[PDB]
Design a binder for this molecule. Structure first.
Ligand SMILES: O=C(CC[C@@H](c1ccccc1)P(=O)(O)O)N(O)CCCCc1ccccc1
Ligand SMILES: O=C(CC[C@@H](c1ccccc1)P(=O)(O)O)N(O)CCCCc1ccccc1
Ligand SMILES: [Ca+2]
Ligand SMILES: [Ca+2]
Ligand SMILES: [Ca+2]
Ligand SMILES: [Mn+2]
Ligand SMILES: [Mn+2]
Lengths: 408, 408
């Protein structure tokens, strides 16, 4: 009767917000069972969660802190969890029949690999790791066509908004990433809303001088904060929209909505538009991913629209935010160009973060790596397709660093 | 297969807008069959429509122009329609096995009356007439429980918006006007948007002396224009919301949205808000009523959110717009108080339209009638209940007139 959940990345932002909303929903009735918690290396934080939630499974990716975890957990009386580590631990959790739904709030390799294993085990995947969809969208589509009872349910706020705007009567006849999703759902176009970031109103001359300290002074992780500032975040979310909802790139419109109340909107084929709105918020997207197709009661503050008073919309300047254009171009090229976009941006974002390059150098580097890449035939074998994605991702990061080194 | 529709009141505003969107949609693909057209007395307008749509049935209410109708239709070649008159003709159309959906674009007695026969024949009724729901909501609820396959689908723009925000997998477990509709749809609260009418920036002293000319100089009929100016239209729509969707009065909030892009919003139990938006428009509400639970392609202009640029929201002042408070008071009292509100407002609206009373006298009269009414035992018998509604409607109109004459 309870929804049996695993949280991958349980000490990160998404994971901690998921546990917060689960704790609240479990106050009176047993709505969720927290079956498994996994972290990369935050052993002390994981032990504290284990004390509270007492999951059946605990897993830590970094095997150098496996013994530390086991020793900490011994102190919990009358608790004998299955304590695991590394990729093998992740696969064991994903394979458990006692787990229904998996929240993926880790990035990078562990994120893509856990997503893949969750799908291979026909789970419901509440996916918060947009970079998995960008890097490997065609591969995830292939896997979801094999593993018929698996589903990706979006958690990224804008994509949760789009999903909520749809009619569940139609959504239940398809699933995200499936060919023809937009036709079954009568989707014409998507308005993808953005905060615009901190640099949205600067002149070109001002924008040339910005630094990461300017971008880092709503509070989020450093990487995403930089991607919000360049609007590369939105570019990555355009690609994510294309894959999740089978919407053509020409039918995805970025709109800057600085109040961040409308989270995104869907235009249907009759030209009616449905939007989802709330304060900025991750509890609603996370909870909805775990309750869909139902909703359950929360104690969140109700939206006071009269207090909000004013909502504004404008189109972003592609001269000021060239990362948007690069993402459209990569997405439209398809093949492995999104993989290359993602990987090159990882390097360029970090160089800017660390004060090694200027704002317009971010897009310069990314553009040069995209122009250097040559289309490759897509492997038919799933395990070889994954190998190819990893090869291309590593090549694109090394290529970005080579461009930096040569200019330097 | 095609959507088989009858239009009641086919030369009125709703009826011509219905025929317009049917015509435009049929140019894209032929999906609607107009099976019947019924008009009050525009004998030559009905002829022109029959020429175009060639329905199986034609009906005119006024027997005086009945013969003239038949004369005109002889001139259409290879066209043998069934041509009917009056209430008898309306009942014959509603009983046709050929007709699935009936648009009610008429008012008064004939308005509630045609709605009743459509329900008794288990049809889909696209209902624009809020005064029917306000005045006779109990009779309609009872009828909808006798005739289980009948459904009312709302066309009033705000109520269509609300309905469009829902997941039809949940809607299909219930229907409009059913007890528990909001609980089954997980609805917590409604934002009922309003244009605010012409008087939001007026002071109390300015309102004291406004005239109907000030109200009548978005273009609509006189009665609803005056209701928009006093915000009694919104008050009626609050009661309509309560009946259609079973939302408690303390969970319906009126919000003034002068741009009229967001047409209304639904807050679910998780606090997520979903809204419908488009240009001001009656084509989408009418079309959705006929396509529900599907959507079809239109050639309407797409919403350009960046061009709209700014949306604003504020709370209405109850001191400036006392009709709003009277509507909530009547709705919360329940029983036949809504019937009394509607009927007394019909008289007061017309008194102001004809320069016989001032703006605050409208609410004064309505308030005095409501205070004179005493709750009635609600008949369990459907026929007796309809008689009660008619008796109370008549009483309230006469009481409003009595109050005006005693002061005058
Ligand atoms: O992609 C993102 C971050 C980047 C986007 C953003 C930024 C600020 C607000 C809204 C959107 P962007 O439009 O600038 O690319 N979300 O999905 C953020 C969600 C967090 C919402 C929240 C929770 C707590 C406190 C405050 C904001
Ligand atoms: O109740 C109504 C009329 C009263 C409300 C109103 C008035 C203007 C705009 C929006 C709403 P109110 O909020 O002032 O009470 N609708 O449902 C009107 C729908 C027609 C929309 C449209 C179509 C064509 C041209 C222009 C406006
Ligand atoms: Ca160690
Ligand atoms: Ca929905
Ligand atoms: Ca298209
Ligand atoms: Mn996002
Ligand atoms: Mn209305």
């Amino acid at each position: 009767k309870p929804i049996n959940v695993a949280i991958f990345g349980s000490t990160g932002s998404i994971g901690t917000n998921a546990l917060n909303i689960i704790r609240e929903c479990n106050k009176i009735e047993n709505v969720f069972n927290v079956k498994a918690l996994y972290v990369n290396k935050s052993v002390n934080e994981l032990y504290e969660q284990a004390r509270e939630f007492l999951p059946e499974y605990l897993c830590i990716h970094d095997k150098s802190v496996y013994e530390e975890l086991k020793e900490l957990v011994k102190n919990i009386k009358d608790y004998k969890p299955i304590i695991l580590c590394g990729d093998e631990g992740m696969k064991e959790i994903c394979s458990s029949n006692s787990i229904d739904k998996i929240v993926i709030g880790i990035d990078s390799f562990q994120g893509l690999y856990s997503t893949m294993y969750a799908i291979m085990n026909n789970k419901i995947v509440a996916l918060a790791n947009k970079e998995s969809i960008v890097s490997a969208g065609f591969f995830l589509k292939k896997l979801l066509n094999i593993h018929k009872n698996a589903k990706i349910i979006p958690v990224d706020s804008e994509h949760s908004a789009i999903f909520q705007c749809l009619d569940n009567n139609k959504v239940l006849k398809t699933k995200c990433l499936q060919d023809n999703f937009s036709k079954i759902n009568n989707i014409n176009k998507i308005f993808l809303c953005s905060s615009g970031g901190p640099f949205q109103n600067l002149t070109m001359d001002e924008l040339k001088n910005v630094t990461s300290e300017n971008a880092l002074k709503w509070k989020m992780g450093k990487k995403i904060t930089i991607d919000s500032a360049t609007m590369m975040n939105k570019g990555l979310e355009v690609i994510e929209t294309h894959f999740l909802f089978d919407v053509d790139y020409n039918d995805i419109e970025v709109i800057v909505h600085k109040e961040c109340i409308i989270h995104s909107c869907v235009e249907f084929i009759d030209k009616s538009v449905i939007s989802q709105m709330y304060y900025p918020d991750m509890q609603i997207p996370i909870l909805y991913s775990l309750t869909w197709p139902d909703r359950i009661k929360t104690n969140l503050k109700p939206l006071d629209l009269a207090q909000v008073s004013t909502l504004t919309f404008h189109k972003p300047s592609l001269e000021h935010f060239p990362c948007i254009k690069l993402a459209y171009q990569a997405g439209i090229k398809g093949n492995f160009y999104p993989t290359v976009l993602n990987a090159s941006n990882e390097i360029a974002n970090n160089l800017f973060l660390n004060n090694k390059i200027k704002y317009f150098d971010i897009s310069s580097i990314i553009s040069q790596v995209l122009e250097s890449f040559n289309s490759q035939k897509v492997s038919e074998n799933s395990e070889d397709l994954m190998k190819q994605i990893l090869q291309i991702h590593s090549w694109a990061k090394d290529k970005a660093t080579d461009i930096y080194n040569k200019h330097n």
